[PDB]
């Protein structure tokens, strides 16, 4: 019926980005930015923090707006619009908190990215560098 609101985080340290590999559709088997849906009555920035905490077990500090991703896929019947925030700083150490949803995690150099990447990640990366 109508477009849904998502969000994401581009977590970058030392010219490397933190990517997580999805097990489940959509975009199953792709490496991508952490993120997810914004909940009813939740500010978008509190959603980025919560969702990265839920997925990676870390707490973002000082995340700034980077871009907005259109995820339009008429064939599979979905439309998400997803603001993506850049973060250089956080507390805790990243881990796959939910083994049912993700099966790998890593720091990758922006010139040597893994494949395949989620659409959201390709668009985000065109902004960063």
Topology:
Blueprint (H helix, E strand, L loop, with lengths): L3 E10 L2 E7 L8 E2 L2 E3 L6 H13 L2 E3 L2 E10 L4 E10 L1 E3 L10 E8 L9 H10 L1
Parallel strand pairs: 1-7
Antiparallel strand pairs: 1-2, 1-4, 2-3, 2-9, 5-8, 6-7
Strand content: 35-45%
Assembly state here?
monomer
Helix and strand content put the structural class at alpha+beta
Euclidean distance between termini CA atoms: 35 Å
Radius of gyration: 14 Å
- The level of helicity is 10-25%
H/E element string? EEEEHEEEEEH
Question: Would you identify the CATH architecture?
Answer: Alpha-Beta Complex
CATH class group: Alpha Beta
Estimate the global geometry from the Cα principal axes. globular
The biggest beta sheet reads: 7 strands, mixed
PDB class: hydrolase
Keywords: niaid, NUDIX hydrolase
Assembly: monomeric
Entry title: Crystal structure of MutT NUDIX hydrolase from Burkholderia pseudomallei
């Amino acid at each position: 019926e109508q477009p849904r609101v998502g969000c994401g985080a581009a977590i970058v340290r030392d010219g490397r980005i933190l990517l997580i590999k999805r097990k489940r559709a959509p975009e199953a088997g792709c490496w991508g930015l952490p993120g997810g849906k914004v909940d009813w009555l939740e500010p978008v920035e509190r959603a980025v923090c919560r969702e990265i905490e839920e997925e990676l077990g870390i707490a973002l500090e000082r995340a700034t707006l980077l871009c907005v991703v259109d995820h339009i896929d008429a064939a599979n019947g979905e439309h998400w619009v997803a603001p993506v925030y850049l973060a250089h700083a956080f507390s805790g150490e990243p881990r796959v908190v939910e083994p049912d949803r993700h099966e790998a995690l890593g720091w990758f150099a922006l010139d040597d990215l893994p494949q395949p990447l989620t659409h959201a990640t390709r668009i985000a990366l065109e902004q960063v560098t």
